[PDB]
Coordinates of N, CA, C and O in Angstrom, one line a residue:
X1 N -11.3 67.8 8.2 CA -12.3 67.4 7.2 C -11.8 67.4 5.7 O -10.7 66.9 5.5
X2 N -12.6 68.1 4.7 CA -12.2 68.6 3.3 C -12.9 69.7 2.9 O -14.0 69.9 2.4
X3 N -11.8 70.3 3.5 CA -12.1 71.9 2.8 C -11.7 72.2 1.3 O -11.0 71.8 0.4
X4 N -12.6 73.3 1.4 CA -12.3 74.6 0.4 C -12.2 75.7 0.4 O -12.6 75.9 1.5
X5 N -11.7 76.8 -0.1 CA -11.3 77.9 -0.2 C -12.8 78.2 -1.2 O -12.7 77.3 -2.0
X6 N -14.1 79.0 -1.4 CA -14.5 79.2 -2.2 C -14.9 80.8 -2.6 O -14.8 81.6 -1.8
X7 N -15.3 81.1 -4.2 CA -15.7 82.5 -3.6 C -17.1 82.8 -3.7 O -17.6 83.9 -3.3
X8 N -18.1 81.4 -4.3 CA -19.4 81.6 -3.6 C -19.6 80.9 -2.7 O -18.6 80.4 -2.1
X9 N -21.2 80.6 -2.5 CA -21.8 79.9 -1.4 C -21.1 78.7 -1.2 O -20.5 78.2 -2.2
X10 N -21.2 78.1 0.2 CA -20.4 76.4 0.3 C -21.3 75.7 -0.7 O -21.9 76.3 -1.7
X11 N -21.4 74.8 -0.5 CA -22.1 73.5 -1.1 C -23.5 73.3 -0.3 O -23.6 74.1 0.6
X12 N -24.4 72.4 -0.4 CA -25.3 72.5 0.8 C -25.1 71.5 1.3 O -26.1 71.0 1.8
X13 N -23.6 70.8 1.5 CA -23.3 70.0 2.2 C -22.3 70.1 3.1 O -22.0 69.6 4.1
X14 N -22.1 70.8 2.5 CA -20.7 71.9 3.5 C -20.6 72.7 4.4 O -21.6 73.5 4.4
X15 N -20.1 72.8 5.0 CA -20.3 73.7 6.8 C -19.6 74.7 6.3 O -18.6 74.4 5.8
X16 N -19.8 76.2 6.5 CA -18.9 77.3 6.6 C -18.0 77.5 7.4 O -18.5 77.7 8.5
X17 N -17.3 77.5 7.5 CA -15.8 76.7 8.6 C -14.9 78.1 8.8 O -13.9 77.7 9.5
X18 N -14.9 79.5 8.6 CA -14.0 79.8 8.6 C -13.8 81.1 7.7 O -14.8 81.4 7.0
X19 N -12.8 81.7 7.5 CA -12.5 82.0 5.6 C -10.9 81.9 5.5 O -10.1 81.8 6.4
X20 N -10.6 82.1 3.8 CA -9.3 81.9 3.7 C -8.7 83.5 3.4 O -9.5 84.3 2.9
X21 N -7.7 83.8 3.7 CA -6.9 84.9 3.1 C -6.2 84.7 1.4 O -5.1 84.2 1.0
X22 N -7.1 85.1 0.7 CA -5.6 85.0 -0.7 C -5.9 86.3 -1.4 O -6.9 86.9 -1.7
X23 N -4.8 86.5 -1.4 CA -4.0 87.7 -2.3 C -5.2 89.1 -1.8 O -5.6 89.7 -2.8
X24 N -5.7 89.5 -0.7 CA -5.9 90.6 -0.1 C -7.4 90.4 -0.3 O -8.2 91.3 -0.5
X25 N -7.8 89.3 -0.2 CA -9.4 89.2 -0.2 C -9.9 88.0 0.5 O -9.3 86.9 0.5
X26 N -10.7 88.2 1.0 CA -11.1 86.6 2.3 C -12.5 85.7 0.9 O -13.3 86.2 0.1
X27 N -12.4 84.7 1.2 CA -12.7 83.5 0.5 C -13.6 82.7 1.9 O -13.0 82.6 3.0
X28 N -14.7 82.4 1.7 CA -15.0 81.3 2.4 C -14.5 80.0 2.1 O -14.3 79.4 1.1
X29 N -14.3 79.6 3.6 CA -14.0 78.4 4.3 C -14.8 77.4 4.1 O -15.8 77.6 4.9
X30 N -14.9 76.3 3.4 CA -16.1 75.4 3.4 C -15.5 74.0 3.4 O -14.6 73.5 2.8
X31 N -16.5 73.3 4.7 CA -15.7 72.2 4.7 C -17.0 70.8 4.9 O -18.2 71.1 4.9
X32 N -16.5 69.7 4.9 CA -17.8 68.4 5.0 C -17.1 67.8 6.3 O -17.5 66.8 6.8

């Protein structure tokens, strides 16, 4: 799809997909 890495909520178009690892803190995964 087209993800993101974010550190709030996805979009309200975006599916929660997951999360990312960066630099020792998890990030949601948000994708369309």
């Amino acid at each position: 799809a087209t993800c993101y890495c974010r550190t709030g909520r996805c979009a309200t178009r975006e599916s929660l997909s997951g999360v990312c690892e960066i630099s020792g803190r998890l990030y949601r995964l948000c994708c369309r």
